[PDB]
C-alpha cells in the first residue's frame, strides 16, 4: 500500500501546511467530490498525500487534529470515504508525479 502521488518534501524548517482550498494533488482520474485529503508526515522529511478515507489514516475524520497530519480540500469536495480510489499498489503502478494547480501557496523550503 502507498500513496497515488510522489511526495512533497520538506527543505526547510518549516512545516507543511496550506490555506483552506489548496493543496489537493491534481488527478483527472478522479471527480469534484473526491478532493479531500490529508498529508501525512513519513534527511529531510516526506509528506505523503492520501484521499480522506483511505491509507494509514482511514479512520480519522477531516479535520481531527493530530501529529503529523495536515488536512486540505479543494472547494465542493464531499465527506465520504474515498473507498473507490483506495490507496496504490507499488508492485503495479508508479507513484503519479504530485501536482498542483500553478500559484499554490506552498511554505518555505517546499517546491511542486
Known amino acids: 500500500t502507498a500513496s497515488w502521488f510522489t511526495a512533497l518534501t520538506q527543505h526547510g524548517k518549516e512545516e507543511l501546511r496550506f490555506p483552506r482550498g489548496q ?14 485529503g ?3 508526515r ?10 480522506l478515507g483511505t491509507g494509514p489514516e482511514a479512520s480519522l475524520p477531516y479535520g481531527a487534529n493530530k501529529e503529523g497530519i495536515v488536512w486540505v480540500a479543494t472547494e465542493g469536495a464531499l465527506n465520504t470515504p474515498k473507498d473507490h480510489i483506495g490507496t496504490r499498489n507499488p508492485n503495479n503502478n508508479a507513484a ?10 506552498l511554505p518555505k523550503g517546499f517546491y511542486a
Do not use: E
Open 38 to 40: 490529508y498529508y501525512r
Open 96 to 105: 503519479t508525479v504530485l501536482q498542483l494547480p500553478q500559484g499554490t501557496t
Open 23 to 36: 493543496g489537493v494533488p491534481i488527478n483527472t482520474n478522479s471527480g469534484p467530490d473526491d478532493q479531500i
Open 42 to 51: 513519513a534527511l529531510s522529511p516526506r509528506w505523503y498525500f492520501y484521499y
